[PDB]
From Swiss-Prot, chain B:
Listed name of the protein: ADP-glucose phosphorylase
Comment field (misc): Functions by a double-displacement chemical mechanism and ping-pong kinetics through a covalent nucleotidyl-enzyme intermediate.
Organism name: Arabidopsis thaliana (Mouse-ear cress)
Residues annotated for Zn(2+) 1 binding in this entry: C26, C29, H82, H133
Molecular function as annotated in GO: ADP binding; nucleotidyltransferase activity; ribose-5-phosphate adenylyltransferase activity; UDP-glucose:hexose-1-phosphate uridylyltransferase activity; zinc ion binding
Length: 301, 299
């Protein structure tokens, strides 16, 4: 039983020692959705993916200007034409296309000075927040830098000032390696917030996700797919969430040395209670050392 | 209504608002882990008792990038009767629960290794409640938790700019639901969760255990009132409530802007990748409306 902390989360977690507990988005029903931003391949009727506006946005894109107006961008990335397909089934190249699509939309949004952070995330399973069965992910552009981002900046800065190094650049030395690709490495975070949480860290120190090129997008697409399929097997296809942790749009040169983006995957295996809500501190039932060994021994035969 | 971002010194974080539309024997009975004390003192016909948690999150037997899992994890059995819910207990009986917390808090405070104590209650399996018997818990931590740090920072920034304690302005900053002799319940302005309710003491006090017997019964009544109204208006949803107090080593300098309170959160919805990734929440109901609906509810 012990408390562990990491510059990235900049918060203590308690470790105290597992399985899971057509449609308007399909090709042909495009008018059934909200205005399209673009698709892939470009303007092709036989599309592999498309990004559209979210019909009922959390933040409205039509309000550009103690409280702040709800302006922001809430877009939806339809990951496939086929309804029965799950992001995990798509081929490495097809995922890379999804990853490149994010980059594209991120670059467009970056043109607005009113935006300070963009959150790319994926929900699979109703209990994990996924309102629809069709494979899809989302993008939320916020006018403010979110708490996790602020905390991260603070933590990685404190660590950088004391060691002169970027915690994520030491992924293989600070965390527990599960798998590794050509440009990325997946690990079980040392001070992981959730049981069986997995981070996919780029091996090259880059401060923002959209700095990703086509070669790395396919290479990342493969590691992501491998991590999702192993999760699905070892944990019995549990619902899950993955989110891209990148830098704010106005990130400073001064912050660059210790700002390194990554992708977080969290399989839903348990909920929270009054302790968590009240403290912001979580209780992880499984150490990452064990999650690492289990995920390394899992096979897809 | 139209979307808005709202922030409050207490949470020190932005929440996104985007919209009466909402809705939803045993070993603890009079065999358990070591007892700390009971009420009335050492009485076989007890109303409540606090014991050790059989499978603690933090072990009390470890006193000393990582820190040993030392800490105190205790369980407060709120009643002898299994079928009773905290909400059914009379105002005086709850006050007893509240005084028992204070008692245990005072004992724990004797340890310099502890920096924060989290008192919380879980009702309903989906809300973290492992057992049906009415009970709450206490977790003593060797570190000051994120929400406490954030709150200290937010209420400090606000105090430096206005020279006032945000919670002392409960009636003016938030939306009043009900009021008792020494407390007032409100729908927080920048509430994290839909139908979130805060019960704020009217007297500026930095720590919960500074509460006396008169206020404990008066608070017991307001708390009971808020739980029963929630149960009615929302169709008996699971819920969580937690006491937000000051760190054990809170400084004199922090005192003017450190004001404790009790947070009640009815479980009406879960989170997704957006929340986990940003730490920012999406609230579907403004507090103005929560306030009006809770004020019109009748028991
Ligand atoms: Zn579909
Ligand atoms: Zn780095
Ligand atoms: Zn019982
Ligand atoms: Zn005050």
């Amino acid at each position: 039983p012990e408390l562990r902390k990491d510059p990235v989360t900049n918060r203590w977690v308690i470790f105290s020692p597992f399985k899971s507990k057509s449609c308007p988005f399909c090709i042909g029903r495009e008018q059934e959705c909200a205005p399209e931003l673009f698709r892939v391949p470009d303007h092709d009727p036989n599309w592999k993916l498309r990004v559209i506006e979210n019909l009922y946005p959390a933040l409205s894109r039509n309000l550009e200007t103690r409280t702040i107006v709800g302006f922001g961008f809430h877009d939806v990335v339809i990951e496939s034409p086929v309804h029965s397909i799950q992001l995990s089934d798509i081929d490495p190249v097809g995922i890379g296309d999804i990853l490149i699509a994010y980059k594209k939309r991120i670059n467009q949004i970056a043109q607005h000075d009113s935006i300070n952070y963009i959150q790319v995330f994926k929900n699979q399973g109703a209990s994990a927040g996924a309102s629809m069965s069709h494979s899809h992910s989302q993008m939320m552009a916020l006018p403010v830098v979110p708490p996790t981002v602020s905390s991260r900046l603070d933590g990685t800065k404190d660590y950088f000032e004391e060691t002169g190094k970027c915690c994520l650049c030491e992924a293989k030395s600070k965390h527990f390696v599960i798998d590794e690709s050509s440009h990325f490495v997946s690990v079980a975070p040392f001070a992981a917030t959730y049981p069986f949480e997995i981070w996919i860290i780029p091996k090259d120190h880059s401060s923002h996700f959209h700095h990703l090129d086509d070669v790395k997008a396919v290479d990342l697409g493969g590691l992501l797919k491998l991590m999702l399929q192993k999760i699905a097997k070892q944990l019995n296809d549990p619902p899950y969430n993955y989110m891209i942790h990148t830098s704010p749009l106005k990130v400073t040169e001064s912050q660059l040395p210790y700002t390194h983006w990554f992708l977080q995957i969290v399989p839903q295996l348990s909920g929270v209670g009054g302790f968590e809500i009240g403290t912001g501190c979580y209780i992880n039932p499984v150490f990452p050392e064990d999650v690492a060994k289990v995920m390394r021994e899992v096979s897809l035969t």
